[PDB]
Amino acid sequence: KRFVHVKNPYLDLMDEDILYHLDLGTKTHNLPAMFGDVKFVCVGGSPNRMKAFALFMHKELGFEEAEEDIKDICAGTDRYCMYKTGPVLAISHGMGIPSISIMLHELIKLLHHARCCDVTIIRIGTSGGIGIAPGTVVITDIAVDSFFKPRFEQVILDNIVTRSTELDKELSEELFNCSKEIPNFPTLVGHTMCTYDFYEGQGRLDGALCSFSREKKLDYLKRAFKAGVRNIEMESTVFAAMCGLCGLKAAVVCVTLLDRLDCDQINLPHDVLVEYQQRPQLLISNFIRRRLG
Amino acid sequence: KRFVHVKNPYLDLMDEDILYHLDLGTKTHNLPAMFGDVKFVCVGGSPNRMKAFALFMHKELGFEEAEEDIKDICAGTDRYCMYKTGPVLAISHGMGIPSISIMLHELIKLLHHARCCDVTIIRIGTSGGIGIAPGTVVITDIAVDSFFKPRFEQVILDNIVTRSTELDKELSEELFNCSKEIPNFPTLVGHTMCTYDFYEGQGRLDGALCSFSREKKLDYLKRAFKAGVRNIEMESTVFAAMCGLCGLKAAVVCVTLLDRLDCDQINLPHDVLVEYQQRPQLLISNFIRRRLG
Numbered sequence: 259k260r261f262v263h264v265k266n267p268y269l270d271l272m273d274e275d276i277l278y279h280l281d282l283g284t285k286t287h288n289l290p291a292m293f294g295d296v297k298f299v300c301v302g303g304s305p306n307r308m309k310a311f312a313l314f315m316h317k318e319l320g321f322e323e324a325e326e327d328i329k330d331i332c333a334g335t336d337r338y339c340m341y342k343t344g345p346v347l348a349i350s351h352g353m354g355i356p357s358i359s360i361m362l363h364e365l366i367k368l369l370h371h372a373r374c375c376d377v378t379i380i381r382i383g384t385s386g387g388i389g390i391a392p393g394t395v396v397i398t399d400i401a402v403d404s405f406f407k408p409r410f411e412q413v414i415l416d417n418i419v420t421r422s423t424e425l426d427k428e429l430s431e432e433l434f435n436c437s438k439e440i441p442n443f444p445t446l447v448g449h450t451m452c453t454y455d456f457y458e459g460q461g462r463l464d465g466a467l468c469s470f471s472r473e474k475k476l477d478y479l480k481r482a483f484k485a486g487v488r489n490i491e492m493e494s495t496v497f498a499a500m501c502g503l504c505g506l507k508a509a510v511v512c513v514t515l516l517d518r519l520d521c522d523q524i525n526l527p528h529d530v531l532v533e534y535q536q537r538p539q540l541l542i543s544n545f546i547r548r549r550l551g
Numbered sequence: 552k553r554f555v556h557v558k559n560p561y562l563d564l565m566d567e568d569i570l571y572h573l574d575l576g577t578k579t580h581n582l583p584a585m586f587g588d589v590k591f592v593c594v595g596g597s598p599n600r601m602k603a604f605a606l607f608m609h610k611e612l613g614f615e616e617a618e619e620d621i622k623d624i625c626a627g628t629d630r631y632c633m634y635k636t637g638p639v640l641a642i643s644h645g646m647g648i649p650s651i652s653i654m655l656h657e658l659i660k661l662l663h664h665a666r667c668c669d670v671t672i673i674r675i676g677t678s679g680g681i682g683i684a685p686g687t688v689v690i691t692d693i694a695v696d697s698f699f700k701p702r703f704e705q706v707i708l709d710n711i712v713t714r715s716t717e718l719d720k721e722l723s724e725e726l727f728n729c730s731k732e733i734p735n736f737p738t739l740v741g742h743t744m745c746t747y748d749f750y751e752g753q754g755r756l757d758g759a760l761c762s763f764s765r766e767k768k769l770d771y772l773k774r775a776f777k778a779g780v781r782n783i784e785m786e787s788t789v790f791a792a793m794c795g796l797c798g799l800k801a802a803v804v805c806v807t808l809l810d811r812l813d814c815d816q817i818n819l820p821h822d823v824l825v826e827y828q829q830r831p832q833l834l835i836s837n838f839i840r841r842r843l844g
């Protein structure tokens with residue numbers, strides 16, 4: 259049994275641990291009772307996406323539906339919103355490295371407090387593609403920074419520390435194998451670039467700020483493609499680094515919404531976009547069903 | 552008249568601009584009609600905080616209440632949520648530098664498209680204090696990074712570019728003058744440190760990861776205090792940098808919830824916390840009333 263670890267000798271010395279952004283705590287809640295049975299954590303941007311994911315889990319796998327307390331609705335608050343369906347826990351993380359990092363610190367502590375074991379964690383979401391068809395599901399093999407390097411640079415106090423961004427190889431391979439079973443479901447494995455800015459950080463020409471030319475954009479993106487990058491998003495490096503440090507097996511599965519070699523703004527009918535957006539959760543549902551069979 | 556500027560020669564060349572994360576666009580909406588009258592933009596973390604701020608604006612200043620479309624509620628989505636009351640626009644930004652940066656790119660473009668002028672923008676929120684009483688409202692004079700330097704480091708394509716984090720001096724002074732009118736309202740001007748991580752980035756001992764000692768935490772925080780830092784949050788440097796680049800007059804006003812020299816977790820009664828949390832909006836309401844008188 260692979261228990262979820264923390265890397266913090268102070269944590270066990272505390273009288274109580276308050277997970278402020280989850281609205282949970284070790285004294286206020288029975289965390290082993292509430293979460294000890296979690297085997298799969300799926301994380302994504304918005305409360306609504308993740309609530310919908312949990313409902314999909316109910317419908318696809320027949321797990322007990324996530325309970326709703328109507329006098330404490332999480333959506334709209336400063337908390338990360340959780341929706342549990344049997345052994346699957348869906349959690350929102352907002353946008354960007356700092357936002358997901360707060361959620362991950364508190365989630366990893368939660369799984370540790372609950373004495374969970376053999377947990378798989380998977381990020382689902384959207385991304386920009388490079389040189390691949392819009393609607394393609396990319397399974398990340400390695401997450402890279404803006405310089406196409408597999409690293410996450412932490413600032414700890416006033417010191418810079420570099421961490422590796424390795425994602426579980428067997429898991430990425432298993433997800434790719436699952437994808438083969440799904441018809442009309444274009445999938446590939448490739449590197450994923452994670453940036454701190456959506457606009458200039460991704461070579462966009464449509465921000466409030468653009469200090470470079472179209473030619474420089476395309477050169478950057480073509481070099482990224484040569485390095486093996488196939489999509490671009492905003493959470494994968496810190497996700498890979500933290501999950502890796504705490505011995506959790508992690509994967510990233512994102513659909514592309516456009517080919518960035520061609521444009522910066524989406525030009526898809528609404529119904530097609532809806533179709534693309536549900537593709538990662540479809541793969542994850544196949545995966546979980548296979549694991550549990 | 553000081554119009555809101557962008558720094559992007561490509562923007563005017565586009566047929567249409569889609570502000571995806573605001574759910575607005577130049578073709579789908581009449582942006583000058585909808586927003587040309589905006590003079591004050593207040594930004595903060597959550598949809599609920601900002602909706603409440605807008606209601607407070609209605610009650611305090613008598614501006615028309617923000618309209619609610621019940622078939623398209625923003626809270627819970629991947630969008631930044633807007634609540635307009637007369638010349639005041641309240642907008643949510645989520646947590647952290649990347650999250651606020653996406654909102655700022657689209658907001659600055661919005662104000663430009665709407666031909667707004669003479670706009671003041673103010674971030675309100677919470678923070679950790681250093682060596683000052685919990686509940687203190689800190690008006691930022693300068694925003695600094697984890698190294699106590701007034702800089703914001705952008706990664707543009709694969710290049711690092713440093714930007715200044717100057718906030719409008721006259722504005723910070725005017726807000727401080729307004730605060731003097733409010734009884735039972737502890738306020739100070741000081742530097743604000745902005746970090747990419749809430750836990751190790753702020754010297755916390757309670758994260759899933761803690762790679763340093765209590766002694767090192769306290770030394771870091773004491774050096775920050777010596778530099779002039781009085782509070783710690785997660786958006787001020789990119790906010791100051793972008794607003795500055797686009798010639799918008801900006802300020803940051805955050806209340807402290809704890810003294811980080813003493814603890815990492817909040818220990819306040821709920822009712823006291825509620826009291827503290829509303830302090831920045833109280834100052835902003837005084838400020839706006841004065842400007843409009």
Ligand SMILES: O=c1[nH]c(=O)n(COCCO)cc1Cc1ccccc1
Pocket residue numbers: 353384385386387456460490491492515516522523524571629
């Ligand atoms: O190009 C992208 N880059 C990216 O980091 N993502 C991930 O989500 C960021 C917030 O929507 C998603 C996309 C696709 C996209 C394109 C235009 C508008 C919205 C999303």
Ligand SMILES: O=c1[nH]c(=O)n(COCCO)cc1Cc1ccccc1
Pocket residue numbers: 278336646677678679680749753783784785808809815816817
């Ligand atoms: O110490 C802090 N650091 C900080 O960056 N903020 C700003 O908000 C971050 C998300 O809640 C707020 C605080 C106060 C605090 C302390 C404990 C829990 C929550 C918030």
Ligand SMILES: [Co+2]
Pocket residue numbers: 269270370
């Ligand atoms: Co422990």
Ligand SMILES: [Co+2]
Pocket residue numbers: 449484485486487
């Ligand atoms: Co490669």
Ligand SMILES: [Co+2]
Pocket residue numbers: 562563663
């Ligand atoms: Co223009």
Ligand SMILES: [Co+2]
Pocket residue numbers: 742777778779780
């Ligand atoms: Co100083």
Ligand SMILES: [Mg+2]
Pocket residue numbers: 389390517519520
């Ligand atoms: Mg193409």
Ligand SMILES: [Mg+2]
Pocket residue numbers: 682683810812813
């Ligand atoms: Mg003290």
